[PDB]
Design an enzyme around this catalytic site. Structure first.
Site, short mmCIF file in Angstrom:
data_model
loop_
_atom_site.label_atom_id
_atom_site.label_comp_id
_atom_site.label_asym_id
_atom_site.label_seq_id
_atom_site.Cartn_x
_atom_site.Cartn_y
_atom_site.Cartn_z
CG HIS A 36 23.05 41.31 35.08
ND1 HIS A 36 23.63 41.10 36.31
CD2 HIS A 36 23.10 42.65 34.86
CE1 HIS A 36 24.03 42.26 36.81
NE2 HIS A 36 23.71 43.21 35.95
CB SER A 88 23.17 47.66 28.79
OG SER A 88 23.30 47.68 30.20
CE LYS A 95 28.40 57.46 30.02
NZ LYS A 95 28.98 58.59 29.23
CG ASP A 96 27.64 54.20 36.26
OD1 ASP A 96 27.06 53.15 36.61
OD2 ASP A 96 27.58 54.65 35.10
CD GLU A 127 6.84 67.33 48.90
OE1 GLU A 127 6.77 68.32 48.14
OE2 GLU A 127 7.54 67.29 49.94
C1 HEM Z 1 12.71 54.25 49.28
C2 HEM Z 1 13.27 55.05 50.44
C3 HEM Z 1 12.58 56.01 51.17
C4 HEM Z 1 11.82 57.03 50.71
C5 HEM Z 1 11.35 57.29 49.27
C6 HEM Z 1 11.54 57.86 51.87
C7 HEM Z 1 10.77 58.99 51.83
C8 HEM Z 1 10.35 59.70 52.92
C9 HEM Z 1 9.49 60.85 52.84
C10 HEM Z 1 8.85 61.48 51.62
C11 HEM Z 1 9.40 61.31 54.09
C12 HEM Z 1 8.82 62.64 54.52
C13 HEM Z 1 9.90 63.70 54.50
C14 HEM Z 1 9.40 65.04 55.00
O1 HEM Z 1 8.85 65.79 54.16
O2 HEM Z 1 9.54 65.34 56.21
C15 HEM Z 1 10.10 60.38 54.95
C16 HEM Z 1 10.17 60.51 56.30
C17 HEM Z 1 10.74 59.60 57.13
N1 HEM Z 1 11.37 58.46 56.70
FE1 HEM Z 1 11.66 57.89 54.88
N2 HEM Z 1 11.99 57.30 53.05
C18 HEM Z 1 12.64 56.17 52.62
C19 HEM Z 1 13.22 55.26 53.48
C20 HEM Z 1 13.18 55.29 54.84
C21 HEM Z 1 13.70 54.25 55.70
C22 HEM Z 1 14.40 52.97 55.22
C23 HEM Z 1 13.41 54.64 56.98
C24 HEM Z 1 13.64 53.95 58.16
C25 HEM Z 1 14.84 53.05 58.49
C26 HEM Z 1 12.80 55.92 56.88
C27 HEM Z 1 12.41 56.67 57.95
C28 HEM Z 1 11.75 57.85 57.88
C29 HEM Z 1 11.40 58.62 59.04
C30 HEM Z 1 11.79 58.34 60.50
C31 HEM Z 1 10.72 59.70 58.58
C32 HEM Z 1 10.09 60.78 59.47
C33 HEM Z 1 10.91 62.00 59.84
C34 HEM Z 1 10.91 63.05 58.75
O3 HEM Z 1 9.81 63.46 58.32
O4 HEM Z 1 12.00 63.47 58.32
N3 HEM Z 1 12.60 56.31 55.56
N4 HEM Z 1 10.67 59.39 54.23
C1 HEM Z 2 14.30 51.15 42.51
C2 HEM Z 2 14.37 51.76 41.16
C3 HEM Z 2 15.17 51.27 40.14
C4 HEM Z 2 16.46 50.88 40.23
C5 HEM Z 2 17.32 50.79 41.50
C6 HEM Z 2 16.84 50.51 38.87
C7 HEM Z 2 18.10 50.08 38.53
C8 HEM Z 2 18.51 49.78 37.27
C9 HEM Z 2 19.91 49.60 36.92
C10 HEM Z 2 21.10 49.76 37.87
C11 HEM Z 2 19.94 49.44 35.56
C12 HEM Z 2 21.18 49.38 34.66
C13 HEM Z 2 21.83 50.68 34.15
C14 HEM Z 2 20.84 51.62 33.48
O1 HEM Z 2 20.43 51.34 32.33
O2 HEM Z 2 20.44 52.63 34.09
C15 HEM Z 2 18.56 49.43 35.11
C16 HEM Z 2 18.18 49.17 33.84
C17 HEM Z 2 16.89 49.18 33.43
N1 HEM Z 2 15.83 49.52 34.24
FE1 HEM Z 2 15.73 50.09 36.11
N2 HEM Z 2 15.78 50.62 37.98
C18 HEM Z 2 14.76 51.11 38.74
C19 HEM Z 2 13.50 51.36 38.25
C20 HEM Z 2 13.09 51.08 36.98
C21 HEM Z 2 11.84 51.56 36.39
C22 HEM Z 2 10.72 52.31 37.11
C23 HEM Z 2 11.82 51.14 35.08
C24 HEM Z 2 10.81 51.27 34.12
C25 HEM Z 2 9.31 51.11 34.38
C26 HEM Z 2 13.09 50.45 34.90
C27 HEM Z 2 13.48 49.92 33.71
C28 HEM Z 2 14.74 49.46 33.39
C29 HEM Z 2 15.07 48.93 32.11
C30 HEM Z 2 14.08 48.67 30.98
C31 HEM Z 2 16.42 48.81 32.08
C32 HEM Z 2 17.20 48.47 30.80
C33 HEM Z 2 18.13 49.61 30.43
C34 HEM Z 2 18.75 49.45 29.05
O3 HEM Z 2 18.15 49.89 28.05
O4 HEM Z 2 19.85 48.86 28.98
N3 HEM Z 2 13.89 50.51 36.02
N4 HEM Z 2 17.68 49.75 36.15
C1 LIG Z 3 -0.04 60.92 52.73
O1 LIG Z 3 -0.22 61.69 51.54
C2 LIG Z 3 0.99 62.06 51.07
C3 LIG Z 3 1.13 62.91 49.81
C4 LIG Z 3 2.50 63.07 49.18
O2 LIG Z 3 2.72 64.08 48.53
O3 LIG Z 3 3.53 62.17 49.29
C5 LIG Z 3 4.92 62.55 49.09
C6 LIG Z 3 0.00 63.59 49.28
C7 LIG Z 3 -0.25 64.90 49.82
C8 LIG Z 3 -1.37 65.67 49.37
C9 LIG Z 3 -2.25 65.16 48.36
C10 LIG Z 3 -2.01 63.87 47.81
C11 LIG Z 3 -0.90 63.06 48.24
C12 LIG Z 3 -0.69 61.80 47.67
O4 LIG Z 3 -1.00 61.69 46.27
C13 LIG Z 3 -0.82 60.50 45.63
N1 LIG Z 3 -0.12 59.44 46.18
C14 LIG Z 3 0.05 58.25 45.53
C15 LIG Z 3 0.78 57.19 46.14
C16 LIG Z 3 0.94 55.97 45.41
C17 LIG Z 3 0.37 55.82 44.09
C18 LIG Z 3 0.56 54.51 43.33
C19 LIG Z 3 -0.36 56.88 43.48
C20 LIG Z 3 -0.52 58.10 44.20
N2 LIG Z 3 -1.20 59.14 43.65
C21 LIG Z 3 -1.39 60.34 44.31
C22 LIG Z 3 -2.18 61.48 43.62
F1 LIG Z 3 -1.45 62.60 43.59
F2 LIG Z 3 -2.47 61.13 42.37
F3 LIG Z 3 -3.32 61.72 44.26
#
Ligand code: HEM
Ligand code: HEM
Ligand SMILES: CO/C=C(/C(=O)OC)c1ccccc1COc1nc2ccc(C)cc2nc1C(F)(F)F
Ligand SMILES: CCCCCCCC/C=C\CCCCCCCC(=O)OC[C@H](COP(=O)(O)OCCN)OC(=O)CCCCCCC/C=C\CCCCCCCC
Ligand SMILES: CCCCCCCC/C=C\CCCCCCCC(=O)OC[C@H](COP(=O)(O)OCCN)OC(=O)CCCCCCC/C=C\CCCCCCCC
Ligand SMILES: CCCCCCCC/C=C\CCCCCCCC(=O)OC[C@H](COP(=O)(O)OCCN)OC(=O)CCCCCCC/C=C\CCCCCCCC
Ligand code: HEM
Ligand code: HEM
Ligand SMILES: CO/C=C(/C(=O)OC)c1ccccc1COc1nc2ccc(C)cc2nc1C(F)(F)F
Ligand SMILES: CCCCCCCCO[C@@H]1O[C@H](CO)[C@@H](O)[C@H](O)[C@H]1O
Ligand code: FES
Lengths: 80, 147, 380, 61, 295, 379
Positions: free
Chosen positions: F201, F205, F227-228, F271
């Site tokens: 901000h 943008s 749009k979003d 994954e």
């Molecule tokens: C940035 C947000 C999050 C991401 C990227 C995320 C991602 C994941 C992933 C990759 C798994 C494994 C899914 C599977 O293959 O079974 C998982 C499992 C789980 N997550 Fe999250 N999670 C998020 C937030 C949360 C939050 C906020 C909670 C708790 C309040 C939560 C609770 C759990 C639990 C209980 C499991 C285990 C059960 C299952 O495998 O489905 N996660 N989450």
């Molecule tokens: C938790 C993940 C993220 C959230 C919730 C998030 C959210 C946002 C939002 C809502 C905007 C404004 C609308 C848009 O341009 O899409 C924005 C803009 C932006 N975000 Fe993220 N973002 C995330 C991750 C990242 C990552 C990984 C990068 C790059 C390493 C990034 C770079 C930027 C930049 C550079 C802008 C400026 C966009 C423009 O050109 O106006 N963001 N992001």
């Molecule tokens: C607990 O392990 C969870 C794995 C996964 O796929 O997560 C969704 C997983 C399963 C099999 C083999 C490897 C992984 C995790 O792999 C990674 N996990 C990473 C997590 C964080 C960061 C910063 C880098 C990572 N890099 C990697 C990389 F693929 F390169 F090995």
């Protein structure tokens, strides 16, 4: 930004000394303590009263409660 | 103040007393007969402590392998002769080799072949490395402390 | 651009405009030290909570032992456990003085800051409530059972909300696992709302003991109040730690060193000290629903204080009548506290109903009245 | 005049002030700990394992 | 400046204004005035200075003629040494929001005429220099503080000063600025002072010296100013110091030297502060004090 | 203030960032991912809480508690589906968010960019720990293999590792601390996301042409709110379609088997969203060097802002950079693919090449071609 828009002030002078020229805790006996007492005195009668009135209530109720556990010998006189 | 409190909390994350209790295992060498091998559970996985007879430091220490798979040269990291300490886990896909048979008198992983000679080394089979050799000692000879 | 990178930077400008160049009244007393303590306390509870959560197991067959394992096996696990449970107390001692101060010095006139304050209180109470269930001892189970059972006294939507909240027919494992999740969650909401609290506050700036504009004499929060607050911290922290390290089980109920048992109701089910006064008011009205309502209002009444201010002066500094009434109220609370820890028997039952009655009377009737009376004594 | 010397050598430059705080902490720890344990143990003569340890430490069976 | 003196030397002689008090002026006596002249206007405490097309011999002759009265006792030829004035780190803030702009003056204790460090100090002041809204140089001035002052509109003007006295002195600066820019100006100013104690460059000094040279030469432009110099030199240094000598002293100054001298008088010292006008935005001695350390 | 949307300390915030916020009149659909990322995040948190309420962090109950959740909990299977797949959607969205920024030179907004990188890392660590929770075979060996790489850091190697595990191998103590981290990290993400948007901000943008949009700004609402919202439903349809019609499309079947420390799976692979990094990891045979290569594969993002040589902001008018960009994208599909393939010829060499090309394109080619392009414009 809140410093500069606060208030309209005129004709007030203030004087202060660096902390390195003065004493951190000065006049403990001639000033400090006397005021500590002054302050204590002026509040005691507003605060203490109700706390004391509570201590009593507490003390009474605690005892009155224990008294009701002891027995009254006047329930086993007609037991011969 | 800070240094201690931070230390205390960081420590909270390292191994607890119960986990540490299973850290090391002390085996009695004075109860393992020649040739016969014995497996003890150590850290969930098997632990092999064999008492190499007379024809093992001979018939299994003369291995004329040039480019031996896992570069295991005894003088590198091993001690007691009639004593061979290993981690009973095939380095292929973590299967527990059997000290019973073994195409080379050593061990045999009934998962995909992998024959390990009586020196804890991969011979005929898929497993890449040799059955890992852990840390220990004989502070008290009739005793070996692994872990 | 701006010369010093403390005024221009979108982040250092924030740390600066709320903790370094922030204009504070030159005369706020030590009763203004609790806000920072509450904050520090919160950060502390969260840190120790995470450390404990990393060795806990939310299951009825392992909860009690996982905590025992933490104290007995985890490096300094006993210490972390002590600080967390006792920290919750410190938290409440601090919050009650924070509120008191606000009532005495009319800070509630800052309505939004005040109303968010109330929400923080409620959230904190629910947080400690669920947190208390985690060790799964006898008081953990029966406290959970008795209290959550009150909702079934609500009309219709009652008997439902309860079995919905429990996830079954009685407090059981499903209740435990959802309580761990809530306990882990609520603290962050507290932190969240705390930010809102301080935002509204900063609109007006701090109030001060005399209740008159401090615009003619403002001072930079740093070093004045940073040093004053840090000192206030160490002052409180000494007794907290002293009681914690030398009398660990002073505040706790021994009934909680015994694993929860659904077939054995404890003789005396009572909460931690900070909930006693409310427990007393709960039990004061015999009739499941009316007691619930009385408990609800005992806390929700705080949302009304801003509207029962009749004085022409902001604080009570110059109002001797209100001052004693105020201390009567405080003492009224020690009594309810005491009553809350006593069994339901004469004389306690009647003393209890009185104290409750006086509590609402003082806030709804006397205070607004005495204020009006006082304005006339100043010829206003 | 240590105050004077200390101020010129230790407290003047913020760089030497911090360096002083570190060595100050290092030395203070070592000392405060020994003294603390020493006080604690002395207050508990003969009750700690450290004390009754000799009775079973290579002096039995 | 009177307030600066009034507080910097509070409780002493230097704390008084030259014009005196309202009460004194209302009640001073024909006597007191006579007494002052008799007590103070005396031969050993005076110097007859002349500059222009005049013969020294011719001049000294005339002196002997109208500067008669010789002394008998030993007290009449004794030049009294004054009781030393104690410096105090403090502040006086005269607030009146009805005034158009604020005045701020901050300073540390100076050495006093005799001390050779005074040369360096003046070189230092030459680096920070001075400024006012009608300087055409504008954003290009060599003075970092003047530059910022222009870039951010920090003040209407500012000046550094090294006011020397027999046994003491005041080394500081004074600026005039709008109510809402006092803070930043003070901030940038104290900044430049810290730069002096810690990072002065040989480039900055080279120029400072040239500015100081031109300055000393400019103080000898006419007979009145040359006469003023002689009168003061004898009275303060007990002799005359030529441009040839001064210049030598000035040429001796280098970065290294300026840093050490400024650190000696400025670093971590408790300054004296005088603020007059709509000064709300400038605040807390403590904050000003912390500005006295860490570049 | 007349309207209570400008004066109120809270409604002023909702207003000054979602209603009167000045947005470029021409931002394309590639600007829709920020909001999706946000919504995604609130969604993951909500479904996560719902699952956490029936989970049990213990090696003897983890696998089954999840099974219990799918089989017994009202709509538990659905909530579970949405969570695991939501993690994918999250990454698909985040990758496009990044691409967009690389193509249109958004990274010139350095603080907004650097916080973006931090968000990515946090999100990766989050999914990493979350993956361990169901405690299946891939959950255990993934955890085992990856966390074991740290012991390759000389000196403090085995240390940090056995500290992180809380023991001698990935076991229960590791599980319970992972549940805590997985429950925590998402909130940090939300936290930092706030900071992300704050820095953004400051500038406002960027837009596809890369030129000041000051002459034509428009109120975020209704333009971009509509749009979003549309951009949401568009993406959501495939997310849900794949979720409800092919639940196990993305998942590894080896995770339907309770973790076993005595049985290493034949092919340990992450994954889809980690594959490309996995490929770069193994590309360098030498435990430490592979770790460093993996590290840099992501940390390289902090360097982009400094390798911009073009005098134009976007790539809209730079045909040379455009193809180089698309070469890079394709370079990534390759690494992805390689990541899912066993370590054997031809894969091993194809992999090392793709890795090599990846860093080359970003560190050498891009800055070079930009310079070359400036001269072709006579600049
Ligand atoms: C940035 C947000 C999050 C991401 C990227 C995320 C991602 C994941 C992933 C990759 C798994 C494994 C899914 C599977 O293959 O079974 C998982 C499992 C789980 N997550 Fe999250 N999670 C998020 C937030 C949360 C939050 C906020 C909670 C708790 C309040 C939560 C609770 C759990 C639990 C209980 C499991 C285990 C059960 C299952 O495998 O489905 N996660 N989450
Ligand atoms: C938790 C993940 C993220 C959230 C919730 C998030 C959210 C946002 C939002 C809502 C905007 C404004 C609308 C848009 O341009 O899409 C924005 C803009 C932006 N975000 Fe993220 N973002 C995330 C991750 C990242 C990552 C990984 C990068 C790059 C390493 C990034 C770079 C930027 C930049 C550079 C802008 C400026 C966009 C423009 O050109 O106006 N963001 N992001
Ligand atoms: C607990 O392990 C969870 C794995 C996964 O796929 O997560 C969704 C997983 C399963 C099999 C083999 C490897 C992984 C995790 O792999 C990674 N996990 C990473 C997590 C964080 C960061 C910063 C880098 C990572 N890099 C990697 C990389 F693929 F390169 F090995
Ligand atoms: C709720 C649960 C209740 C649990 C118990 C809570 C703890 C109770 C302990 C009582 C507190 C003892 C403190 C004694 C303080 C003595 C004292 O100094 O009083 C006089 C002094 C004089 O100040 P001025 O009038 O401004 O004069 C200035 C001139 N120098 O008054 C004060 O300090 C102001 C009073 C503020 C402190 C209030 C603390 C009481 C706390 C109780 C909670 C009350 C709120 C209701 C909560 C509902 C939920
Ligand atoms: C034993 C282990 C050995 C290793 C420990 C290494 C510790 C390194 C610490 C860095 C040293 C600090 C140096 C920075 C100097 C900056 C400075 O100005 O001082 C701080 C400055 C002082 O200002 P001046 O007096 O004007 O100084 C001017 C000198 N010319 O600010 C202060 O007030 C510092 C005092 C801080 C006290 C705060 C303590 C309150 C809390 C108490 C409880 C304890 C904490 C527990 C930690 C909790 C973590 C979960
Ligand atoms: C990383 C892991 C990799 C996993 C795979 C990710 C998914 C890969 C799918 C490829 C994407 C297909 C999209 C095709 C888009 C076709 C198209 O429209 O291109 C031309 C079009 C022309 O626009 P202008 O030049 O502005 O002209 C305006 C005049 N009207 O270009 C664009 O739309 C801009 C490009 C933005 C989309 C970028 C998406 C690619 C995503 C990959 C991730 C890359 C980043 C690196 C991540 C490192 C960690
Ligand atoms: C999570 C708990 C809380 C935190 C972290 C907190 C924090 C703060 C902070 C730091 C201050 C400023 C300094 C001070 O005056 O103490 C403050 C002020 C204030 N808080 Fe709270 N507070 C909390 C709960 C509450 C509660 C429960 C109330 C009342 C129902 C409340 C009412 C106020 C009010 C009215 C002020 C104004 C103080 C004044 O200047 O007079 N707060 N709070
Ligand atoms: C507003 C902050 C919090 C308060 C008031 C608080 C309060 C409590 C209370 C009263 C208990 C029971 C203590 C006892 O055993 O008697 C408890 C236990 C617990 N809390 Fe918290 N807590 C807070 C935050 C947290 C956080 C952030 C977490 C998790 C990251 C956490 C994790 C736990 C755990 C694991 C227990 C169970 C072990 C034990 O009983 O000691 N707490 N909490
Ligand atoms: C799971 O139960 C936990 C109790 C506790 O003391 O937590 C620290 C507990 C234990 C025994 C008896 C009662 C309780 C909880 O009591 C309360 N818990 C309350 C929780 C939240 C709110 C807003 C009000 C509450 N009031 C009360 C009251 F004491 F009045 F009954
Ligand atoms: O982050 C954003 O930062 C902006 C700048 O302060 C605020 O106006 C918005 O309300 C907030 O969401
Ligand atoms: S696991 Fe041993 S041969 Fe395959």
């Amino acid at each position: 930004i809140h410093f500069g828009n606060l208030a309209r002030v005129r004709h007030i002078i203030t004087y202060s000394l660096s902390p390195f020229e003065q004493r951190a805790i000065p006049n403990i006996f001639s000033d400090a303590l006397p005021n500590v007492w002054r302050r204590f005195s002026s509040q005691v009668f507003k605060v203490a009263p109700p706390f004391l009135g509570a201590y009593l209530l507490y003390s009474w109720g605690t005892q009155e409660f224990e008294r009701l556990k002891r027995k009254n010998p006047a329930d086993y006189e007609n037991d011969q | 103040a800070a240094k201690n409190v931070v230390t205390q909390f960081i420590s909270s994350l390292s191994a607890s007393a119960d986990v540490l209790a299973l850290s090391k295992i002390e085996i009695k060498l004075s109860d393992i007969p020649e040739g016969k091998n014995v497996a003890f559970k150590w850290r969930g996985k098997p632990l092999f402590v064999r008492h190499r007879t007379q024809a093992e430091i001979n018939q299994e220490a003369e291995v004329d392998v040039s480019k031996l798979r896992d570069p295991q040269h005894d003088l590198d990291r091993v001690k007691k002769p009639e004593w061979v300490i290993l981690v009973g886990v095939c380095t292929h896909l973590g299967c527990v080799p059997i000290a019973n048979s073994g195409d080379f008198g050593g061990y045999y992983c009934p998962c995909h072949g992998s024959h390990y000679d009586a020196s804890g080394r991969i011979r005929k089979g898929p497993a890449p490395y040799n059955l890992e050799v852990p840390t220990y000692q004989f502070v008290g000879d009739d005793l070996v402390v692994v872990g | 651009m701006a010369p010093n990178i403390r005024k221009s930077h979108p982040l250092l400008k924030m740390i600066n405009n709320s903790l370094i160049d922030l204009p504070a009244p030159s005369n706020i007393s030590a009763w203004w030290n609790f806000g920072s303590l509450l904050a520090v306390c919160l950060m502390t509870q969260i840190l120790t909570g995470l450390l404990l959560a990393m060795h806990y197991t939310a299951d009825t067959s392992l909860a009690f032992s996982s905590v025992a394992h933490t104290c007995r096996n985890v490096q300094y696990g006993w210490l972390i456990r002590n600080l967390h449970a006792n920290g919750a107390s410190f938290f409440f001692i601090c919050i009650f003085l924070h509120i008191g101060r606000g009532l005495y010095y009319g800070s509630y006139l800052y309505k939004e800051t005040w109303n968010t304050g109330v929400i923080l209180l409620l959230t904190l109470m629910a947080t400690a409530f669920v947190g208390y269930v985690l060790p799964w001892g006898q008081m953990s189970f029966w406290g959970a059972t008795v209290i959550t059972n009150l909702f079934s006294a609500i009309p219709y939507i009652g008997h439902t909300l309860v079995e919905w909240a429990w996830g079954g027919f009685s407090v059981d494992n499903p209740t435990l696992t959802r309580f761990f999740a809530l306990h882990f969650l609520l603290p962050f909401a507290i932190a969240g709302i705390t930010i809102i609290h301080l935002t509204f506050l900063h609109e007006s700036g701090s109030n001060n003991p005399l209740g008159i504009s401090s615009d003619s004499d403002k001072i930079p929060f740093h070093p004045y109040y940073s040093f004053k607050d840090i000192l206030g911290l160490t002052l409180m922290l000494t007794p907290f730690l002293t009681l914690a390290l030398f009398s660990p089980n002073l505040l706790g109920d021994p009934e909680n060193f015994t694993p929860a048992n659904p077939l054995v109701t404890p003789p005396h089910i009572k909460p931690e000290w900070y909930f006693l006064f409310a427990y007393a008011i709960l039990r004061s009205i015999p009739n499941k629903l009316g007691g619930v309502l009385a408990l609800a209002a005992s806390v929700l009444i705080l949302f009304l204080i801003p509207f029962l201010h009749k004085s022409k002066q902001r604080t009570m500094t110059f109002r001797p009548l209100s001052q004693t009434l105020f201390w009567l109220l405080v003492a009224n609370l020690l009594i309810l506290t005491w009553i809350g820890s006593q069994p339901v028997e004469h004389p306690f039952i009647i003393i209890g109903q009185m104290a409750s009655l006086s509590y609402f009377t003082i806030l709804l009737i006397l205070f607004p009245t005495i204020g009006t009376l006082e304005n006339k004594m100043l010829n206003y | 005049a240590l105050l004077r010397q200390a101020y010129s050598a230790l407290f003047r430059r913020t760089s030497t002030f911090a360096l002083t705080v570190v060595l100050g902490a290092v030395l203070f720890e070592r000392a405060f700990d020994q003294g603390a344990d020493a006080i604690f143990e002395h207050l508990n003569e003969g009750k700690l394992w450290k004390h009754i340890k000799h009775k079973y430490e290579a002096s039995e069976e | 400046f009177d307030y600066l003196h009034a507080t910097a030397f509070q409780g002493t002689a230097l704390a008084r204004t030259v014009e005196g008090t309202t009460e004194n002026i209302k009640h001073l006596t024909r006597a007191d005035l006579a007494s002052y002249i008799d007590t103070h206007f005396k031969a050993p405490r005076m110097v007859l200075a002349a500059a222009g097309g005049i013969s020294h011999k011719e001049l000294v002759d005339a002196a002997r003629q109208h500067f008669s009265g010789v002394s008998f006792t030993y007290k009449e030829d004794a030049v009294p040494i004054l009781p030393r004035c104690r410096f105090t780190g403090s502040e006086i803030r005269a607030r009146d929001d009805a005034l158009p702009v604020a005045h701020v003056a901050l300073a540390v204790e100076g050495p006093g005429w005799a001390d050779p460090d005074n040369v360096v100090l003046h070189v230092a002041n030459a680096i920070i220099g001075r400024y006012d809204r009608t300087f055409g140089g504008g954003k290009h001035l060599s003075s970092r503080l003047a530059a910022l002052a222009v870039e951010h509109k920090l003040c209407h003007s500012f000046q550094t000063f090294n006011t020397s006295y027999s046994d003491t002195g005041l080394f500081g600066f004074h600026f005039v600025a709008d109510p809402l820019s006092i803070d930043d100006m003070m901030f940038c100013a104290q900044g430049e002072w810290m730069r002096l104690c810690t990072s002065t460059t040989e480039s900055e000094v080279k120029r400072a010296k040239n500015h100081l040279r031109s300055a000393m030469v400019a103080q000898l432009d006419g007979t009145t100013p040359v006469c003023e110099t002689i009168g003061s030199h004898l009275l303060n240094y007990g002799r005359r110091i030529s441009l040839e000598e001064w210049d030598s002293r000035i040429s001796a100054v280098d970065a290294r030297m300026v840093r050490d001298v400024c650190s000696k008088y400025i670093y971590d010292k408790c300054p004296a502060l005088a603020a007059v006008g709509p000064i709300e935005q400038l605040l807390d001695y403590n904050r000003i004090r912390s500005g006295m350390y860490w570049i």
